[PDB]
Amino acid sequence: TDEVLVHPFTNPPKENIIVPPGSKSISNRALILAALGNGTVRVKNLLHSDDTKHMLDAVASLKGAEISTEDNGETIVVKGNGGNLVTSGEELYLGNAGTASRFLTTVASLVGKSQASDDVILTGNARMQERPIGPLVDALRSNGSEIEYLNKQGSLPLKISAGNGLKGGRIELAATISSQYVSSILMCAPYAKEPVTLALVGGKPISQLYIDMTCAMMKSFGIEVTKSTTEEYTYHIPKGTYKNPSEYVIESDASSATYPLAFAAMTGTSCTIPNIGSSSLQGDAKFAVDVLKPMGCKVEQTTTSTTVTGPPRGHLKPLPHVDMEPMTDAFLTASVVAAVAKGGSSTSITGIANQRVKECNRIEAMVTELAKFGVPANELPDGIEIHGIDIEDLKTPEISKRGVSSYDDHRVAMSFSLLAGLCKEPVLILERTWPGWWDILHSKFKIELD
Ligand SMILES: O=C(O)C1=C[C@@H](OP(=O)(O)O)[C@@H](O)[C@H](O)C1
């Protein structure tokens, strides 16, 4: 963790066009779906990260899916043959890419034998080898997979016997566990022998929006999942093969999009995200229309683009109540916008209890740091209540608590960098995804730093 001193947004540019990096969640799914699909797909706007880099090399190794890059590595070309994969004999090294290991574990259960090997080995580093993966291994074994823990019980490394495939039919999966286990099974379900009924048991899953994103992406690749008539969390997946589209563009990250949009809202300037609109797979795409618009912003949104122009500085309106369940990651951004919407009514955000168990307690972190700016705030039973003030923010002193703590949480720091820009003197962010945001502050918004 490092330090960054954000200078006031003294005279921002009038208009600004920002294309955020691609979504991580969408990037990771697209590579699995393309590897299993039939046809050659050019994947654009992929987010390069631990998952994708390890995923890319893992798919490269398996026989039956070919990976290459074009246009200076910005285009990933995947040619699938319809999911007829065979072992290379190479151990697939996944580092500590948690999502890749969950997705690839079920892919490996589909792989056929070769003369080099009768199995697929999935490995990773020491942190990988402490990650629990039991609930997924249990469900695949229950469906005919043969999986051996090669080191510690319940984690990678895994040896998955090839040539077995998945029986299909009913697969039961506990609902308390990561949605990434559900998603991992959904994407491989069409390749089971028998059509799959994926029934979550033991309660309601928490990250339902990410299950829905997997289903919608599956539909883009030619396979429509259907929900049960009597069970909200039972999914019926046809047997089939994905049809790879000629091109698939990874949506830019709509959560990251909220920070430049909030900048425009908060400075009385204009920001356009030219490739994120109302047809987005991501709930956070609704931030502009469901948060910034009621708060006094002039907002236009087409199916694929979003433009936000804030009201004059100091003129944001409090949003008396907003349910941010469809977009919980954007509540930190909503909170700093609300901090300068003078009331009147407070801004009350509910539906974000799940946001209390992330890197830090983000609700608690937001209340405590807001106090440092002179912004009253308090927790609600289901969220947060912000008592916005005039842009008479507390003037910042040097080397005497000018530090805003980010609690090692990426989003907390980016949110408070916006509020920092509205103060009368520079503000230092302490204990500081999207490294380019700090670059974009200086290159696009032309904000001085350090
Ligand atoms: O499938 C995905 O891409 C994601 C599902 C969620 O995981 P959990 O269901 O474990 O919360 C989310 O927290 C994570 O950031 C990404």
Residue numbers in the entry: 387 to 818, 824 to 841
Give sentences copied directly from the paper behind this entry.
In the human fungal pathogen Candida albicans, ARO1 encodes an essential multi-enzyme that catalyses consecutive steps in the shikimate pathway for biosynthesis of chorismate, a precursor to folate and the aromatic amino acids. In Fungi and Apicomplexa, the second to the sixth steps of the shikimate pathway are supported by five enzymatic domains combined in a single protein known as Aro1 or AroM. Aro1 forms a flexible dimer allowing relative autonomy of enzymatic function of the individual domains. Our activity and in cellulo data suggest that only four of Aro1’s enzymatic domains are functional and essential for viability of C. albicans, whereas the 3-dehydroquinate dehydratase (DHQase) domain is inactive because of active site substitutions.
